Design a binder for this molecule. Sequence first.
Ligand SMILES: COC(=O)[C@@H](Cc1ccccc1)NC(=O)c1cc(C)c(S(=O)(=O)Nc2cc(C(F)(F)F)ccc2Cl)s1
Length: 150
Amino acid sequence: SDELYRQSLEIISRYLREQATGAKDTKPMGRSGATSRKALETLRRVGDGVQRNHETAFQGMLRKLDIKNEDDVKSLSRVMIHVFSDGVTNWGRIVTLISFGAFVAKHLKTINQESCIEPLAESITDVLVRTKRDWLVKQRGWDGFVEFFH
Ligand SMILES: COC(=O)[C@@H](Cc1ccccc1)NC(=O)c1cc(C)c(S(=O)(=O)Nc2cc(C(F)(F)F)ccc2Cl)s1
């Protein structure tokens, strides 16, 4: 019964999976699909920029966390709650979180741990929704995300 969680996971999972594999998911979107489609298109544009600009920082974080398997992916939300909460909440920081997700998803594909990508998307979505639900609600959720970056 948690639409914010469901929609956020759908968007984040889609972005991480396509980033890691290079393949678009042809399956139709769930509820509020038009918005989710625009949110995904927005992440492709903004998140690809973030990944280019944040390579150094993202490599630094990946080295320190040393993520190599499902056990490391399952412990990630505890670390990322700390990292993500340690700064001003805005849409930019939220994109950075998801973009770091995509960066880690690409790494997981590289080391033949592609099966960890869905658990990673869950972890990222957990961090976002658990820490920022109230903020996301006030900022009009994914409709707000799309509008902000238009
Ligand atoms: C305000 O929006 C920013 O300025 C974004 C870019 C941006 C600019 C314009 C449009 C969209 C985005 N950038 C940042 O918010 C950040 C960049 C760094 C390097 C940090 S950090 O120092 O806290 N490191 C760190 C933090 C996270 C996160 F997101 F979970 F908090 C994951 C991974 C890393 Cl390595 S936050």
